[PDB]
Nucleic acid binder design. Structure first.
Lengths: 56, 123, 209, 114, 119
RNA sequence: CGAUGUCGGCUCAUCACAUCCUGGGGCUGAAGUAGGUCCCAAGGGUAUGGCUGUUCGCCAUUUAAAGUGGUACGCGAGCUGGGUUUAGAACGUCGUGAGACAGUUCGGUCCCUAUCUGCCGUGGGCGCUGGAGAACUGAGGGGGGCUGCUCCUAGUACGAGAGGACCGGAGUGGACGCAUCACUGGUGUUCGGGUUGUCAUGCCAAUGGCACUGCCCGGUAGCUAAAUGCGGAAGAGAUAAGUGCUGAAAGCAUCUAAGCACGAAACUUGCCCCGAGAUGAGUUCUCCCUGACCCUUUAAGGGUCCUGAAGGAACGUUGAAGACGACGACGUUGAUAGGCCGGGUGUGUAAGCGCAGCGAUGCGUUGAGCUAACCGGUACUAAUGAACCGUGAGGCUUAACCU
RNA sequence: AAUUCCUUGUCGGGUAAGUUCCGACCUGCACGAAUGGCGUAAUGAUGGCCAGGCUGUCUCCACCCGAGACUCAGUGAAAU
RNA sequence: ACACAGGUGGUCAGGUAGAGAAUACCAAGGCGCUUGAGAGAACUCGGGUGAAGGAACUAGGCAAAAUGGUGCCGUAACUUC
RNA sequence: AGGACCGAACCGACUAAUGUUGAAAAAUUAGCGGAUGACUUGUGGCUGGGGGUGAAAGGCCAAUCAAACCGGGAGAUAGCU
């Protein structure tokens, strides 16, 4: 239930070695407005795949 | 599907009215008993002047179970109650001279020819 | 003797005129086209490698496309291998159909079993549950003890514990072949074979006779 | 699938009479004792039907020799030679399981007129 | 295991799910575009598209059925007078999901769901 | 003694052979069936109940058998708390008494979110010497190995009879293990209906909310056992106890000293599964890359421009795959999921209208209406043109060919 | 026997089988008459045994509904 | 010790069903309990259902399951009536 | 009429489960006992430590009871660690 010897900072780093986040590989460029956005998601202006899907 | 502590009705006129299964014979660690397999029973209720008294220990063959039996075509025959026919402890032949209620085709063998001969209907 | 690769269509029953209902599994065994023949001279053992079915032409990658192209055969949905018996020859472009099993009586069907996910000890190894009452505390389906007190101060290798059940290769041995329908590439085997509907199956002649 | 449908419909029997729960049917089954085959009649009330194409079944319940007996027949089985509706009953359910706790006057089923 | 099953539980009991989907379907057909989480949006289709399909043929029985599944007479009236003739030729698929990022409060993947011919 | 929790039970075991059964054999005061004793053999199997807290024991009934032991008389950071073993109380006894009893009887808090080793699963990184996609070989490892009864041989051999075989063959079971939902069923709060109380939609009618899914009656797919298929083997090699052939030492005898043969569920294979991280990193098939230059510490060196392939990853729709990763299908040249159309299944004759009845209600339209996960189709919706990683012919020394 | 160590004393009932229970017997280790003896209707969240109904308590577990466990985002302990 | 599933005396007492201030659903009135979103593994908690058997479980029917209202018929030993 | 019966508020805590670094230094859920009485409760007062009080458990006397708590003798003593 509890430890008998204090784990090292080395062991702590070894355990945390897989806890790293993964950056997005590449963003997509909208074909009309030219801005970047996450793949399969609408752009920050409200466009998606050229057409303006949501007003503002 | 008969196991220990199961009460059964009696299908013959041997004098017993309500028996209780206390062992399933024919094999180590055996769980259930279908039709046509011997079980060791105790008599828990009998008629006043019959061939057997209350509390005797003897064998019996199961002729009707509520779970029923299955035939090679996939059919199943289910009965409304579990019934047995009392047998002699050594010869394993029926004590009574008449059978009550129907029985199934699973019994037709040289061992129980008497029972299927005396049965009023063999399903 | 070699076997064939089929697909589980499902289960049904066959009625015989004697009044017996045989439960059968319908295996659609399409033609197995040989794609490479291995020999002692080059590979150190004798075997054939067959394929079956079709695959999307934009889904087949270039290495296996070239491999199929060398044999001059259209791409299938996989590649399986059968060890050759003594005195059994096959050519490269040859197609083998379900009529190979025309007079065999029993087969061995091997497939990847259904996946039960992370299964407990009770389901996986038929362990007994503990009491549901009589004062029991949070231990109704746990595996109980797994060792002894301090002399063998470890758990023994090969212990039965909870884990991934299924989704592994399983062979069911000595099934009776009920019918070989060569006209529509069907094989009906008696019994239940491993695997869900639509999975691949490897049917080989019974080793145990 | 088409393969299973073809396999079942090439084995189905094309002379199955139409019946509903509550009907009183009489099914003739093949009995093979020794080397000879005969026809045993089983007559009762249909308490449940299970429509599954070739895997169709139906449960008939009768009171034979004072003991309630029910048998589930496979509709397309070759052991069943013929089925005959002796009398049609009027019920408002698909499964008449409630009949098992009733005897005599309390288990009568009104005839299905028209 | 949940082999060949369908329907997201969404960490709610069945009555809550039924009521929530009823409300969400009403809101969607009222406003013509709504924003909700991606699994809820994907599950909302299976409730709002059969209602429109039912609404395609105007009949007293169909209206009572739509009323039983929505409990809002204005919603039923709109469905049968507008959404039915508008989608009278479509073979299903009267909605469109557009993934719109992640919610600030709980990082839930959000989406907009709108009728195909909104404009 | 700055705490090593203890009797019995439940769950889960693992080892030894001084073997309980099955297997092989010698002697028998072994006619046969059935036994006694000893030797070899641990591969598998080795009860359910009545009584007591019981281990032990007696008893009832099975079984081929109900083994003896080790593992802190295994196992409470897995469970129990009946006995024992705190505080309360009483009986018998001892003591004047407080109290005490291997004397009994009633009641009496069992904590811990796992850091490390271990074990069951499942990934990430790198290696395997250019990179990649597949399919394998098998060094090694695991699983599995139990047995009854009936029939034929044959009422034969044996025996005065009663009784009753060895060896060999066939069928059908008990327990265990693997797989599956085609059959029989369970679940199926995502499907349909009956019905009680109340509230809401203006009201009737019809519905919806709540009352454990309000209470029930059924039940699709999926998952399941009680349901139904399969398995333990046959065969080979070398053996244990044992049985031998020929044969001296030792004119005889002798299974052994030389030489040769047989012999068991034990060993190695044969059956199933994992398996080249087998760093000893293996084998086979296929695909991709055939540009120009600078620098100094001149070497498996570093840098710039052009170039980005085969393939992989990421994202999306997802799965009878799944805790999360992983694995599998599909991404417009598309049936991957949702919807839609048709069918199947389940429920059981919907609503509206008309007729009969004062009315409850019945009949017709009507086997109607509704129908999830199923089946066969259908691009209507969502699966984007891209972009990212991975490179640009792959070190040295010998040997055999090639020119 | 709330009391008997030997003791599961012996017999009878109940059970196929009853170290507990009930009814007797008396060889009362070591009951006994207001530190009360023996009964006793009614009463008890009192101790023991048996029977009917009822059941996942069990043979033997299976499925389903939610709340955690698992993943993501935010805050963020403890014994040792 | 906390924006703590605990403790705190008196007053008011609506509708329907109900004997009722029990219980269910509502009015007047007030809240959804200060982390959410997914997924639908083992295992834990609180529940629902179950084939055939019905205490074989266990120290013990512990716990679950079952009975449950009103009117009427009828009701034993024993007893201090 | 009743230390009568069934059963809410109210008082209590018999059995099981959960929780045992808890929501809680003893509670929650499902059952349970009393419920016109030797009942229960609010406000104020009285009984003080070898003392009180006790339908009696050495129980309770401010989460502390085979002699409370606070200050003092006091750095008690300790052949012990």
């Amino acid at each position: 239930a509890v430890q008998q010897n204090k784990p090292t900072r080395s062991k702590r780093g070894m355990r945390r070695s897989h806890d790293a986040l993964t950056a997005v590989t590449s963003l997509s460029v909208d074909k009309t407005s030219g801005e970047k956005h996450l793949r399969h998601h609408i752009t920050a202006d409200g466009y998606y795949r050229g057409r303006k899907v949501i007003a503002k | 599907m008969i196991q220990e502590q199961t009460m059964l009705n009696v299908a013959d006129n041997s004098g017993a009215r309500r028996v209780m299964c206390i062992k399933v014979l024919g094999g180590s660690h055996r769980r259930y008993a279908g039709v046509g397999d011997i079980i060791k029973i105790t008599i828990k209720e009998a008629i006043p002047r019959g061939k057997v008294k209350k509390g005797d220990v003897l064998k019996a063959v199961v002729v009707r179970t509520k779970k029923g039996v299955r035939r090679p075509d996939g059919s199943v025959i289910r009965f409304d109650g579990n019934a047995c026919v009392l047998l002699n402890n050594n010869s394993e032949q029926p004590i009574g001279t008449r059978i009550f209620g129907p029985v199934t085709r699973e019994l037709r063998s040289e061992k129980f020819m008497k029972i299927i001969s005396l049965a009023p209907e063999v399903l | 003797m070699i076997g064939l690769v089929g697909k589980k269509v499902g289960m049904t029953r066959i009625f015989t005129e004697d009044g017996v209902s045989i439960p059968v599994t319908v295996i659609e065994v399409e033609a197995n086209r040989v794609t490479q023949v291995k020999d002692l001279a080059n590979d150190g053992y004798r075997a054939i490698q067959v394929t079956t079915g079709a695959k999307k032409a934009n889904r087949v990658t270039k290495p296996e496309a070239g491999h199929f192209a060398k044999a001059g055969v259209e791409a299938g949905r996989g590649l399986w291998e059968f060890r050759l018996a003594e005195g059994e020859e096959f050519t490269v472009g040859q197609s083998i159909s379900v009529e190979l099993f025309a007079d065999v009586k029993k087969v061995d069907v091997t497939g990847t079993s259904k996946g039960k996910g992370f299964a407990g000890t009770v389901k996986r190894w038929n362990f007994r549950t503990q009491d549901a009452t009589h004062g029991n505390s949070l231990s109704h389906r746990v595996p109980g003890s797994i060792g002894q007190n301090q002399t063998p101060g470890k758990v023994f290798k090969g212990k039965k514990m909870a884990g991934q059940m299924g989704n592994e290769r399983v062979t069911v041995q000595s099934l009776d072949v009920v019918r070989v329908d060569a006209e529509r590439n069907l094989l009906l085997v008696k019994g239940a074979v491993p695997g869900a509907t639509g999975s691949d199956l490897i049917v080989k002649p019974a080793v145990k006779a | 699938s088409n393969i299973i449908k073809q396999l079942e419909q090439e084995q189905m029997k094309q002379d199955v009479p139409s019946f509903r729960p509550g009907d009183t049917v009489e099914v003739k089954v093949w009995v093979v004792e020794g080397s000879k085959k005969r026809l045993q009649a089983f007559e009762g009330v249909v308490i449940a039907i299970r429509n599954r194409g070739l895997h169709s079944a139906f449960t008939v319940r009768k009171i034979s020799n004072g003991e309630g007996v029910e048998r589930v027949f496979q509709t397309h089985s070759p052991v069943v030679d013929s089925i005959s509706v002796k009398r049609r009953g009027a019920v408002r359910k698909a499964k008449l399981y409630y009949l098992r706790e009733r005897t005599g006057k309390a288990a009568r089923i009104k005839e299905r007129l028209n | 295991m949940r082999h060949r099953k369908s329907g997201r539980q969404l960490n709610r009991n069945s009555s809550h799910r039924q009521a929530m989907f009823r409300n969400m379907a009403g809101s969607l057909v009222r406003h013509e575009i709504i924003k909700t989480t991606l699994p809820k949006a994907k599950e909302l289709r299976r409730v709002v598209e059969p209602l429109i399909t039912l609404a395609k043929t105007d009949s007293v029985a169909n209206r009572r059925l739509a009323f039983a599944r929505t409990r809002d007479n204005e919603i039923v009236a709109k469905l049968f007078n507008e959404l039915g003739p508008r989608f009278a030729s479509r073979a299903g698929g009267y909605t469109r999901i557009l993934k719109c990022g992640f919610r600030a409060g709980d990082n839930a993947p959000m989406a907009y769901i709108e009728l195909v011919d909104r404009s």
